Coordinates of C-alpha atoms and ligand atoms in Angstrom, one line a residue:
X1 CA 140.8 80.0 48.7
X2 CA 142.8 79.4 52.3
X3 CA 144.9 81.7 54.0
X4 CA 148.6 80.4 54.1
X5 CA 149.9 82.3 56.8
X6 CA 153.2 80.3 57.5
X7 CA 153.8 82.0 53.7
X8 CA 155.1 85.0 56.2
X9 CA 155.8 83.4 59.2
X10 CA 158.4 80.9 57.7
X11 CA 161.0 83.5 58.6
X12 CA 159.7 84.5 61.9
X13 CA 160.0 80.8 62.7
X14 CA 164.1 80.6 61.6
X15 CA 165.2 83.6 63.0
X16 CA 163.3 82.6 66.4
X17 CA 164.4 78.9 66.4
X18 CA 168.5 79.9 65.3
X19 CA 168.6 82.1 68.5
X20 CA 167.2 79.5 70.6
X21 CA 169.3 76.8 69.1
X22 CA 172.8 77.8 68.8
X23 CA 174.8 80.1 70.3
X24 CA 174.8 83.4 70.2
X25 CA 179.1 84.0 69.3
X26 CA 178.6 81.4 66.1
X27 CA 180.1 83.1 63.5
X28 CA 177.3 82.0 61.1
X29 CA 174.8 84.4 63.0
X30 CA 176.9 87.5 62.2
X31 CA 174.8 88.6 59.5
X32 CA 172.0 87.9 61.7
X33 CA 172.5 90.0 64.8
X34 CA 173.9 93.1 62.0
X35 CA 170.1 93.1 61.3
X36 CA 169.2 93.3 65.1
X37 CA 171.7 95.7 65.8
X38 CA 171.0 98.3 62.8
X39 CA 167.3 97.5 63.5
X40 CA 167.0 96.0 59.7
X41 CA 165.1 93.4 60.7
X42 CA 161.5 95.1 62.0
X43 CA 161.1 96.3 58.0
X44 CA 161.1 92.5 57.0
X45 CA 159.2 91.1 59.6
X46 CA 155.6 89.5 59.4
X47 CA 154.4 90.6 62.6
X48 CA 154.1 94.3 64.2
X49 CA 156.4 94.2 67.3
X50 CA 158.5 97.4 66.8
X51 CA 159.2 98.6 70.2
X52 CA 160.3 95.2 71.1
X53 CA 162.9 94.9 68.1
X54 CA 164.0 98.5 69.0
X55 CA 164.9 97.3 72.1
X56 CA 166.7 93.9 71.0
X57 CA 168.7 96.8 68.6
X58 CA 169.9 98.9 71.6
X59 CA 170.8 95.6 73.9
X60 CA 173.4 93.8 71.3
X61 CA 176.4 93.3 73.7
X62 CA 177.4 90.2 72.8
X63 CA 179.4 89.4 75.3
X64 CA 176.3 90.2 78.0
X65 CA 174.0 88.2 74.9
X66 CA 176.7 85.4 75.2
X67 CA 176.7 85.0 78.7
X68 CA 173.4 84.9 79.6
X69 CA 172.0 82.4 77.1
X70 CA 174.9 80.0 78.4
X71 CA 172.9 80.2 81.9
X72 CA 169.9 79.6 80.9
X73 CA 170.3 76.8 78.0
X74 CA 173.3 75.2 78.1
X75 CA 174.6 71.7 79.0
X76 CA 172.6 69.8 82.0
X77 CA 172.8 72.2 84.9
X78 CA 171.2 75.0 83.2
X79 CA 168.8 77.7 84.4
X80 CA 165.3 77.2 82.2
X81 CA 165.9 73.6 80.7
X82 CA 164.6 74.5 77.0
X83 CA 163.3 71.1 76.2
X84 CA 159.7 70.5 75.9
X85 CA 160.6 66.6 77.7
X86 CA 161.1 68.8 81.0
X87 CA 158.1 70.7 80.8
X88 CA 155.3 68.3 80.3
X89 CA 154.6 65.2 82.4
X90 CA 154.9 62.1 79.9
X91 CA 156.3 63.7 77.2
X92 CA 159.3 62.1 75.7
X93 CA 162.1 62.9 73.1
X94 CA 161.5 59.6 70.9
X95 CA 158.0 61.0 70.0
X96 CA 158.8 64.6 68.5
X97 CA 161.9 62.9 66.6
X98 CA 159.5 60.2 65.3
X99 CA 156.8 63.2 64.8
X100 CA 159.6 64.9 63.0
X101 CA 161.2 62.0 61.2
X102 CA 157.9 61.0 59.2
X103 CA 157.8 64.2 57.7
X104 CA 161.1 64.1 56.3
X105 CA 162.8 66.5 59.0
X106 CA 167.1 65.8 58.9
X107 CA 168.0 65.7 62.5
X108 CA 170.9 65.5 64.5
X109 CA 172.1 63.5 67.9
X110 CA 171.0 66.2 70.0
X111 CA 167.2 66.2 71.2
X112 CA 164.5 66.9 68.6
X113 CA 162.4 68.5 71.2
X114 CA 164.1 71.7 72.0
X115 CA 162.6 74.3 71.6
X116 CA 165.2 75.7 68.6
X117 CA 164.6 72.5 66.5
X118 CA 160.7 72.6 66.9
X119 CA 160.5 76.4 65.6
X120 CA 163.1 75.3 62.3
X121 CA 161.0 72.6 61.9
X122 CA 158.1 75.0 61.2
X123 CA 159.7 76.9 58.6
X124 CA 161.5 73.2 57.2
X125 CA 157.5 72.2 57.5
X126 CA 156.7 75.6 55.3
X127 CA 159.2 74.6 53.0
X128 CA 158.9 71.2 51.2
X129 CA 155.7 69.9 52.1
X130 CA 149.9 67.9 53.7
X131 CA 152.0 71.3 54.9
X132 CA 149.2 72.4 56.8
X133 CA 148.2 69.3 59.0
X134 CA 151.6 69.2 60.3
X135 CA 152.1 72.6 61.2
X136 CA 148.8 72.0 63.4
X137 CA 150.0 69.1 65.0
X138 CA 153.2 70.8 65.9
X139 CA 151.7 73.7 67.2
X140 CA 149.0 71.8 69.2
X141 CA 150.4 68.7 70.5
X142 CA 154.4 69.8 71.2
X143 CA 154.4 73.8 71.4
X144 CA 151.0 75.7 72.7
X145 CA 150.5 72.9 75.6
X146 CA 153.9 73.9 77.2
X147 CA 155.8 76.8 75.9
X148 CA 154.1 79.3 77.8
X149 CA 155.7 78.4 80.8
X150 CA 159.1 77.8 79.4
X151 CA 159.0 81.2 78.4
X152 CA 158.1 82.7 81.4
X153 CA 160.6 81.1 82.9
X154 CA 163.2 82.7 80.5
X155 CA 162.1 86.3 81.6
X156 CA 162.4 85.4 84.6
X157 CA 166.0 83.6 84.6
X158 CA 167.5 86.2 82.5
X159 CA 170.1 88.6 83.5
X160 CA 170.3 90.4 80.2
X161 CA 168.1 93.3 78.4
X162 CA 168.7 90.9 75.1
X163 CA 166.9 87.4 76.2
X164 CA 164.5 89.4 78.3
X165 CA 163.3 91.2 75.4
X166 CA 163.0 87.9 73.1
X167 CA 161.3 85.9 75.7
X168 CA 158.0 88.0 75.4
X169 CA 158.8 88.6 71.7
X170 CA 158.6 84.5 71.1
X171 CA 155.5 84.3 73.5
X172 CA 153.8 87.0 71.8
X173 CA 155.3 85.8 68.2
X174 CA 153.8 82.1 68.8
X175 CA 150.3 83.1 70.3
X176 CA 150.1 85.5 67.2
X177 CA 151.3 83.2 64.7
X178 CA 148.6 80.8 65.8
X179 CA 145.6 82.4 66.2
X180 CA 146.2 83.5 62.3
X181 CA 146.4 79.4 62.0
X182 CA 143.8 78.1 64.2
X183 CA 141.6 80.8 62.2
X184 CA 142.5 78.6 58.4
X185 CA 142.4 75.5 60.4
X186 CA 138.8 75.4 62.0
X187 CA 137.6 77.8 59.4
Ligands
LIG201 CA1 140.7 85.6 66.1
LIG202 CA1 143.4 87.2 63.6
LIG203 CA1 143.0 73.2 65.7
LIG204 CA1 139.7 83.0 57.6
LIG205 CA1 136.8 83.0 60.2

């Protein structure tokens, strides 16, 4: 019998993909950034990066947290444009929404390709799902190919402790998550 590994990294995927997707002062992530600031969220967390969740606990200003993710994601003249349409040549929007779309993904009027909706859809994927060819596709065709340098280009762009603590967190979240994958997948 197969491994299903996104069995634990369904979470992973959410919390990842709500702090890249909306901001951080929404009162709906309240209960989200208690965990990160008690440190409650390392003892429910599929993958071992302690030191780096201890220090996303000791950098929750939210005001510093709020500011910085403004710069770097938000609206048309931001820092690090987090759409995977401005990273790859040829890549377009109308392909991940279709991608999405077919798999019975609810989407909204914004972009399907940022880089929020593509980590939800992992755990929506996870969820009611054939599950496990369309968490390789994602993965292969709109994520590993150009996410690596998005990323880099967070830690580089941001001003606070916060986002340059998740930046390598999410780059060292995705490249673990999928080598757990690729290992079920070409097994
Ligand atoms: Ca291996
Ligand atoms: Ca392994
Ligand atoms: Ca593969
Ligand atoms: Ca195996
Ligand atoms: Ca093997």
């Amino acid at each position: 019998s197969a491994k299903d590994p996104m069995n634990e990294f369904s979470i992973l995927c959410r919390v990842l993909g709500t702090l890249y997707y909306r901001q951080p002062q929404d009162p709906l992530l309240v209960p989200l950034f208690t965990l990160i600031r008690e440190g409650k969220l390392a003892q429910n967390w599929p993958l071992e990066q302690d030191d780096l969740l201890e220090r996303l606990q000791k950098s929750c200003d939210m005001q510093q947290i709020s500011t910085d993710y403004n710069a770097l994601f938000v609206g048309e003249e931001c820092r690090v444009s987090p759409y995977r349409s401005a990273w790859q040549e040829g890549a377009t929007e109308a392909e991940v929404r279709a991608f999405l779309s077919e798999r019975g993904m609810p989407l909204t009027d914004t972009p399907a390709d940022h880089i929020g909706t593509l980590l939800l859809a992992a755990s929506w994927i996870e969820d009611h799902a054939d599950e496990n060819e369309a968490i390789e596709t994602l993965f292969e065709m709109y994520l590993l190919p150009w996410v690596g340098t998005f990323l880099g280009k967070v830690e580089a762009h941001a001003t606070s402790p916060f986002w340059r603590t998740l930046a390598p967190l999410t780059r060292d979240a995705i490249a673990a998550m999928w080598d757990e994958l690729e290992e079920e997948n070409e097994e």
